[PDB]
Amino acid sequence: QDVVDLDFFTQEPLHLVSPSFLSVTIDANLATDPRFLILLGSPKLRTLARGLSPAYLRFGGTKTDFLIFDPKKE
Amino acid sequence: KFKNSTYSRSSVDVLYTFANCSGLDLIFGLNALLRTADLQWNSSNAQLLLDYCSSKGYNISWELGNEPNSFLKKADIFINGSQLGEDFIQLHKLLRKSTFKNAKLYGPDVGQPRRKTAKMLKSFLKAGGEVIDSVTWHHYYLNGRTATREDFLNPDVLDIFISSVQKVFQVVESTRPGKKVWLGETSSAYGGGAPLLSDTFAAGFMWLDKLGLSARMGIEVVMRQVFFGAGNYHLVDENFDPLPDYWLSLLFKKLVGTKVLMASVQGSKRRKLRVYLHCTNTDNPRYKEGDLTLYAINLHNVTKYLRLPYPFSNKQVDKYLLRPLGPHGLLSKSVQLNGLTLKMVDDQTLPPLMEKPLRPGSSLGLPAFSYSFFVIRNAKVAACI
Numbered sequence: 068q069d070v071v072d073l074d075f076f077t078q079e080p081l082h083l084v085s086p087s088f089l090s091v092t093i094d095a096n097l098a099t100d101p102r103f104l105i106l107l108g109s110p111k112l113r114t115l116a117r118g119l120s121p122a123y124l125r126f127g128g129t130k131t132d133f134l135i136f137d138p139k140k141e
Numbered sequence: 142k143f144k145n146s147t148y149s150r151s152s153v154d155v156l157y158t159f160a161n162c163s164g165l166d167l168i169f170g171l172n173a174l175l176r177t178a179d180l181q182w183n184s185s186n187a188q189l190l191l192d193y194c195s196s197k198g199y200n201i202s203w204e205l206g207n208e209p210n211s212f213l214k215k216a217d218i219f220i221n222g223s224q225l226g227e228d229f230i231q232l233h234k235l236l237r238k239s240t241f242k243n244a245k246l247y248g249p250d251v252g253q254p255r256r257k258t259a260k261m262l263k264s265f266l267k268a269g270g271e272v273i274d275s276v277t278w279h280h281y282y283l284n285g286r287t288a289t290r291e292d293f294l295n296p297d298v299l300d301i302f303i304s305s306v307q308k309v310f311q312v313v314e315s316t317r318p319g320k321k322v323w324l325g326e327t328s329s330a331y332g333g334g335a336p337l338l339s340d341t342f343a344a345g346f347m348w349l350d351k352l353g354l355s356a357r358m359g360i361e362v363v364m365r366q367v368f369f370g371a372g373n374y375h376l377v378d379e380n381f382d383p384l385p386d387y388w389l390s391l392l393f394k395k396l397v398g399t400k401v402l403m404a405s406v407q408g409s410k411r412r413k414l415r416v417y418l419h420c421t422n423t424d425n426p427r428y429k430e431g432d433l434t435l436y437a438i439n440l441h442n443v444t445k446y447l448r449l450p451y452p453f454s455n456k457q458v459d460k461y462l463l464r465p466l467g468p469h470g471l472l473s474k475s476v477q478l479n480g481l482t483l484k485m486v487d488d489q490t491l492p493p494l495m496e497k498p499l500r501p502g503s504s505l506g507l508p509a510f511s512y513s514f515f516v517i518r519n520a521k522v523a524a525c526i
């Protein structure tokens with residue numbers, strides 16, 4: 068027999084997750100790719116991203132602590 | 142290996158406009174290794190970034206540091222959790238004095254809670270826990286370099302996540318009771334992912350189980366490494382093609398609600414048949430208040446047939462069963478939903494996610510090495526309304 072009975076607890080929420088429970092990252096590493104602007108400009112990629120709305124987009128990773136803001140750079 | 146690099150106003154602009162246009166809330170990690178004469182955080186570069194983001198009206202949330210537990214290994218600098226706590230207090234003062242004075246702050250983005258990591262998280266939350274809106278920590282199951290196919294299918298590997306979650310809540314409950322806990326960066330395997338594994342249908346077992354356990358155990362937010370990038374663990378490849386975990390994520394987003402319930406299997410052999418139960422997402426136009434979303438993983442090598450308990454036995458159920466497109470089986474980069482390949486209609490259009498109505502009273506079929514969502518229509522669960 069490969070038949071299996073489920074038991075459910077339904078009397079109240081055991082937890083509440085954020086509406087953004089399933090979120091995503093972009094690694095700090097990607098901002099060193101010469102093609103950063105082309106890549107995140109892709110409207111195909113933005114279509115895919117919008118499907119996971121609402122969500123956080125966390126920009127971070129090992130490179131977080133090796134990245135310096137330069138107001139002069141182009 | 143780790144050299145200092147600069148980024149431009151342009152880069153910031155690329156990042157923010159991607160998030161804004163995509164309907165996502167940007168969290169930006171600040172450089173924690175900018176240190177004064179006596180290893181205090183030097184906030185002067187962050188001040189430049191905060192001013193500029195303010196001057197553009199960018200609503201951004203902040204982190205400071207990534208995996209501070211390995212700063213010694215990465216940069217030969219040791220920062221204890223007390224000092225890191227003081228560093229977050231200083232960043233919080235700068236946010237309060239900024240144009241966005243309610244801006245959220247998350248940290249400390251530690252690794253999984255090994256003894257030395259648990260000590261650093263405890264001393265961090267004692268010193269700086271008052272100013273963070275959520276505690277962030279990171280989890281990977283495996284080293285991408287050594288991970289095997291069998292690991293990705295192994296309940297013994299899936300279950301290690303449970304004790305990592307238990308140790309995090311033990312540190313938080315002993316220092317900042319009730320503070321929200323987030324997975325700030327997580328995936329199958331580190332080193333950029335396991336080749337031909339982390340980007341396949343097989344990656345789905347680890348990803349759906351982690352979501353099910355996180356929701357069940359009290360984690361509020363899970364951040365997937367990565368949406369897009371070099372690593373095999375990307376949801377989308379560099380050719381902008383979605384991998385099976387993108388489609389899995391999109392179904393989860395559309396079907397799974399915020400209210401977490403519980404399912405378990407009688408005979409209590411919770412190893413290879415893994416089940417999770419939430420209220421249905423009410424943003425889903427097809428469904429209504431009171432509906433349930435069951436999701437199930439079958440790591441058996443045979444079909445299992447699931448029977449719903451009373452009073453749900455004879456409800457209309459919508460099946461959303463994911464199987465790989467051949468010929469690469471579990472190592473495929475293409476997935477079918479109820480026998481139809483998931484593919485974008487064009488660069489601007491996601492496809493419909495078509496359900497399979499099951500005949501009421503029927504057992505829920507779950508093939509070997511598969512995962513499925515099941516929506517129980519007209520469940521009328523008061524907890525869900």
Ligand SMILES: O=C(O)[C@H]1O[C@@H](O)[C@H](O)[C@@H](O)[C@@H]1O[C@H]1O[C@H](COS(=O)(=O)O)[C@@H](O[C@@H]2O[C@H](C(=O)O)[C@@H](O[C@H]3O[C@H](CO)[C@@H](O)[C@H](O)[C@H]3NS(=O)(=O)O)[C@H](O)[C@H]2O)[C@H](O)[C@H]1NS(=O)(=O)O
Binds near residue numbers: 127130207332
């Ligand atoms: O996945 C991780 O390990 C993540 O770990 C967390 O702790 C960090 O928070 C997160 O940032 C990490 O992901 C990102 O960094 C990874 C580590 O990079 S590091 O430079 O080793 O420090 C990175 O993984 C590396 O990716 C390298 C790459 O170039 O893509 C890999 O490099 C190998 O392959 C290329 C050709 O494919 C070759 O030209 C390289 O010389 C070769 N080096 S090798 O290791 O000797 O083989 C490297 O294998 C790998 O460790 C992640 O890719 C990155 N995340 S991202 O989304 O891809 O940016």
Ligand SMILES: *[C@@H]1O[C@H](CO)[C@@H](O)[C@H](O)[C@H]1NC(C)=O
Binds near residue numbers: 176178185186
């Ligand atoms: C902080 O960094 C700036 C810019 O790199 C530097 O000029 C300044 O002297 C540093 N401040 C302290 C207190 O060390």
Ligand SMILES: *[C@@H]1O[C@H](CO)[C@@H](O)[C@H](O)[C@H]1NC(C)=O
Binds near residue numbers: 223
């Ligand atoms: C943490 O580091 C700071 C700065 O290096 C130091 O002055 C302090 O004594 C350390 N705290 C503990 C508890 O070891």
Ligand SMILES: *[C@@H]1O[C@H](CO)[C@@H](O)[C@H](O)[C@H]1NC(C)=O
Binds near residue numbers: 442443
């Ligand atoms: C499933 O695994 C068992 C245990 O090794 C094996 O002997 C059996 O024949 C397998 N069945 C199928 C259908 O592959």
Ligand SMILES: [Cl-]
Binds near residue numbers: 398400422423
């Ligand atoms: Cl919801």
